[PDB]
Amino acid sequence: AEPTPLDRVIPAPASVEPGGAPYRITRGTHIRVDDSREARRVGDYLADLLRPATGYRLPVTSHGHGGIRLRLAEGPYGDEGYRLDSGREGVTITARKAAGLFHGVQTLRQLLPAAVEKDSAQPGPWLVAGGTIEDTPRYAWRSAMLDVSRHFFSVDEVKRYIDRVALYKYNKLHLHISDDQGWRLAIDSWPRLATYGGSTEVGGGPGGHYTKADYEEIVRYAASRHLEVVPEIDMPGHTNAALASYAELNCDGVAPPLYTGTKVGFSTLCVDKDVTYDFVDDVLGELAALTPGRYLHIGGDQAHSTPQADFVAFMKRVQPIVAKYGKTVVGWHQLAGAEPVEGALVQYWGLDRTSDAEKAQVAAAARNGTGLILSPADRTYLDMKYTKDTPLGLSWAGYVEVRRSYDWDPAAYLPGAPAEAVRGVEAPLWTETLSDPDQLDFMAFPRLPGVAELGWSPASTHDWDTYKVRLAGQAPHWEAMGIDYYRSPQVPWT
Ligand SMILES: CC1=[NH+][C@H]2[C@@H](O1)O[C@H](CO)[C@@H](O)[C@@H]2O
């Protein structure tokens, strides 16, 4: 009978001005896109979302009057923002670019009743609160990571996770496609990596890998949901799958057995063998050809078997290879202490218990111009248990309930780091313990939207007490969408 309030959206929109009567979507509603082919793709995506639960035809049309209009226009919304106007006559989403229209659609779906997400016809009514939202993002780096190395996830399961992150306006998908327990991408020049290095996973199950066509399909689908794919080939540590596949990559020339455990820090590429850099060049060159995004993530975490000076020598030689293939380096924050090249970004995954000296090394790099991606392990690691009783996940970084994950400020977080060095945030989901897509959802939700809100919303909107009510408001939508989630006692679920 009553619309959801115009402000009950995550991320919190930059500006919300409620007023006037709601729009009611009915069988006469059309989706109008004018003559833009870019807007027509967004219109078709919206019609796909709405047709099952409404049962309405919802034709996507160039001309029309009233109804839902998606309009590309010059305006003050940048590359990702939009304005959404709703009243008795219709709803109009205006933006500079298709990504902004797409973000406005993600808001519109949160404004609609939870039953709109159902996959068969529902009664409605389909109300959208009256007023105007004007919305633009705080940070440009708003990313979610999936580890498909520890347990492998199929192309369709990666698409499903893309659809989860698209709900909350993430714009980057970091795929961790190599580790000790699996190598997940076909490399034509090193064909044993995928067939043998991809042949298993944590726990000894059958593993799998993406053919180049599978990977292209993941990239294409991600782009259709306005996610830029950031692939990671972790080096020089976390390389057992590669080392097990090619004896010659090992310092002693002996291939180790495939690894199906969960320990870390034991593996290393051979920093002083020429073949090591031919291998990296070949692999990063093939990956670049599949990567229309700007970045290649070279990892750099837990190289505990690589002495410091060898780690530095290795990264000095590898960073220029990323440049050669026309991309920007991203590494885990161990790179900060190993001469990051100009323009390289580092991903901070430390926690409150990380040494002060280690924090200061990252802060010094930031002060020196190195951009920071924040993903603290005791804040935004979605594989981290909520409490001691969580049946999945890890607790190496302690326990991370919903409020802990949300309630901090990226601009005022790492001591000594300039706020302008912070490019944004990431919510990584590591998979030592997760082996099916429902377990992924149970650990991703309900913290995933909170990290998206950190990336997107203005600092002035940040407030746990009001955010938790917006978060409780998502639960019926997730139930209609088939998403399992942790029902935290911190959140006032209805
Ligand atoms: C960057 C980073 N290195 C470690 C750490 O994060 O924790 C993950 C599990 O939470 C683990 O899988 C990974 O090897």
Side-chain angles (χ1 to χ4, degrees):
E2 302 279 285
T4 294
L6 191 65
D7 66 356
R8 183 152 309 151
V9 172
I10 299 170
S15 180
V16 179
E17 291 162 305
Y23 186 59
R24 187 183 174 151
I25 306 178
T26 67
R27 67 190 169 184
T29 300
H30 295 185
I31 287 158
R32 292 154 59 190
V33 296
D34 302 335
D35 252 80
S36 169
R37 201 170 169 274
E38 306 77 55
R40 181 168 293 271
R41 293 190 286 275
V42 182
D44 284 339
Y45 170 89
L46 176 66
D48 290 349
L49 294 182
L50 294 179
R51 279 168 185 159
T54 60
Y56 306 154
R57 181 171 65 97
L58 293 155
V60 182
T61 58
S62 306
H63 315 300
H65 196 284
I68 297 171
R69 188 176 179 194
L70 300 183
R71 167 171 194 245
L72 288 182
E74 202 59 57
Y77 316 115
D79 279 349
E80 298 191 281
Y82 65 91
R83 178 175 175 152
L84 185 153
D85 294 313
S86 171
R88 159 186 20 253
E89 303 296 310
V91 173
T92 295
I93 296 167
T94 299
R96 284 187 59 260
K97 293 294 192 177
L101 296 182
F102 189 87
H103 300 149
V105 170
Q106 306 299 336
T107 290
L108 173 59
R109 78 200 272 203
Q110 288 190 37
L111 289 177
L112 283 156
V116 81
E117 294 294 357
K118 298 257 276 266
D119 58 352
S120 63
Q122 303 298 309
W126 301 115
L127 302 179
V128 182
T132 289
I133 284 163
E134 292 189 278
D135 204 9
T136 54
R138 175 190 189 182
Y139 290 111
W141 188 289
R142 303 182 316 275
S143 71
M145 192 198 82
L146 182 68
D147 175 357
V148 298
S149 300
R150 272 56 177 273
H151 288 91
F152 182 58
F153 289 88
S154 66
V155 166
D156 279 346
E157 283 165 349
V158 169
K159 295 188 167 177
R160 159 177 165 162
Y161 196 70
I162 284 170
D163 289 328
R164 308 298 198 230
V165 311
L167 300 172
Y168 300 107
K169 308 181 180 80
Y170 286 94
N171 66 5
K172 287 159 183 74
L173 180 63
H174 171 191
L175 293 177
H176 183 89
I177 53 172
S178 69
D179 213 288
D180 293 314
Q181 302 90 338
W183 180 279
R184 305 302 185 201
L185 177 64
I187 308 289
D188 293 337
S189 52
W190 297 80
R192 200 162 155 76
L193 298 172
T195 298
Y196 185 71
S199 66
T200 192
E201 61 191 335
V202 170
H209 65 278
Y210 305 127
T211 64
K212 297 200 172 189
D214 289 331
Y215 190 77
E216 287 167 336
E217 174 61 15
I218 289 173
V219 166
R220 179 204 70 76
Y221 191 82
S224 88
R225 274 59 183 151
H226 295 287
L227 293 169
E228 173 179 24
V229 175
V230 180
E232 180 185 351
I233 300 297
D234 198 336
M235 46 189 63
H238 284 282
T239 43
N240 194 73
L243 296 168
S245 293
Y246 283 96
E248 58 264 54
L249 297 179
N250 292 272
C251 284
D252 61 1
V254 177
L258 288 169
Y259 189 57
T260 64
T262 57
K263 293 186 178 179
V264 304
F266 62 85
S267 60
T268 184
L269 297 181
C270 191
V271 171
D272 74 334
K273 268 189 164 208
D274 288 331
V275 70
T276 292
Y277 305 93
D278 295 337
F279 161 83
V280 171
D281 188 281
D282 281 350
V283 168
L284 298 184
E286 297 194 26
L287 178 61
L290 291 170
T291 299
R294 294 163 286 177
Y295 307 97
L296 301 174
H297 199 306
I298 57 168
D301 66 306
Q302 289 173 341
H304 291 166
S305 298
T306 311
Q308 186 61 22
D310 280 355
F311 177 91
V312 177
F314 173 80
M315 296 300 203
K316 193 175 169 181
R317 180 138 177 210
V318 171
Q319 294 174 86
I321 297 171
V322 177
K324 163 179 177 179
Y325 292 111
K327 303 295 179 190
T328 294
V329 168
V330 181
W332 300 103
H333 68 266
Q334 285 69 38
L335 185 61
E339 312 183 60
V341 294
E342 187 157 347
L345 303 179
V346 303
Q347 189 166 351
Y348 178 79
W349 59 280
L351 58 151
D352 289 345
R353 292 173 323 208
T354 295
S355 98
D356 291 336
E358 175 169 326
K359 306 187 193 169
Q361 207 178 53
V362 174
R367 278 194 309 273
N368 189 43
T370 296
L372 296 186
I373 296 144
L374 298 181
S375 63
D378 59 351
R379 297 291 182 165
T380 70
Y381 270 38
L382 303 173
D383 57 313
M384 214 66 53
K385 289 186 189 179
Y386 299 101
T387 74
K388 72 168 165 299
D389 293 309
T390 305
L392 297 166
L394 295 177
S395 54
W396 71 263
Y399 299 104
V400 183
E401 259 288 7
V402 181
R403 180 176 186 154
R404 184 176 181 75
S405 187
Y406 173 76
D407 203 18
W408 56 285
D409 184 353
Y413 173 75
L414 184 65
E420 63 274 17
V422 177
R423 296 283 186 275
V425 294
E426 174 167 301
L429 180 58
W430 299 98
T431 59
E432 281 90 335
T433 69
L434 311 174
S435 64
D436 70 59
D438 301 316
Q439 293 180 340
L440 297 183
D441 285 338
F442 182 82
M443 298 305 289
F445 291 82
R447 295 172 298 187
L448 184 72
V451 184
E453 169 141 326
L454 300 173
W456 176 280
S457 299
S460 62
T461 65
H462 185 279
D463 175 62
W464 166 248
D465 281 349
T466 51
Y467 174 73
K468 76 185 181 182
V469 173
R470 295 181 280 114
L471 186 58
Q474 307 289 308
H477 293 249
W478 299 331
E479 159 188 63
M481 293 168 201
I483 299 170
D484 286 354
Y485 65 99
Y486 167 60
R487 245 174 112 85
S488 168
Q490 313 176 329
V491 173
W493 311 107
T494 63

